[PDB]
Design a protein around this ligand. Structure first.
Ligand SMILES: [Cl-]
Ligand SMILES: [Cl-]
Ligand SMILES: [Cl-]
Ligand SMILES: [Cl-]
Ligand SMILES: [Cl-]
Ligand SMILES: [N]
Ligand SMILES: [N]
Ligand code: NA
Ligand SMILES: [Pt+2]
Ligand SMILES: [Pt+2]
Ligand SMILES: [Pt+2]
Length: 129
């Protein structure tokens, strides 16, 4: 599913991501824009053999099981395919565990490089939230 900008904002809010760990809803929408261009079916293979999955490009080395990342863990206790669903629940619950891990949203490279420090409130402008 390719979400609209305000549509994704509303879904993230209902699922409790807004202001989670102090990160406003605009931060989460901006991260999704630059990680996946709002496409739940996005995938990206990394040089180490791990793969990134879904709207927030969550990685198989630590967070989900895909059966093809040797030595990896599955700390969200889910198949990586669950992160590709039109329903964003699995992606949201796993993101909550990642952003509590120690480095905050710096865990998302696209967030650090393209959202951090910017006018992120622009991502939710106009939305009936
Ligand atoms: Cl915001
Ligand atoms: Cl790829
Ligand atoms: Cl594996
Ligand atoms: Cl959720
Ligand atoms: Cl933080
Ligand atoms: N939720
Ligand atoms: N949730
Ligand atoms: Na894994
Ligand atoms: Pt939902
Ligand atoms: Pt939820
Ligand atoms: Pt729901």
């Amino acid at each position: 599913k390719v979400f609209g900008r305000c549509e994704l904002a509303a879904a993230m809010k209902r699922h409790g991501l807004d202001n989670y760990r102090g990160y406003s809803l605009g931060n989460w929408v901006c991260a999704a824009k630059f990680e996946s261009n709002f496409n739940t079916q996005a995938t990206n293979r990394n040089t180490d053999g791990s793969t990134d999955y879904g709207i927030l490009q969550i990685n198989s080395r630590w967070w989900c099981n895909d059966g093809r990342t040797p030595g990896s863990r599955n700390l969200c206790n889910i198949p990586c395919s669950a992160l590709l669903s039109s329903d964003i629940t699995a992606s949201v619950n796993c993101a909550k565990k990642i952003v509590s891990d120690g480095n905050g949203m710096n865990a998302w490279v696209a967030w650090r490089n393209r959202c951090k420090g910017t006018d992120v409130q622009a991502w939710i402008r106009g939305c009936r939230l």
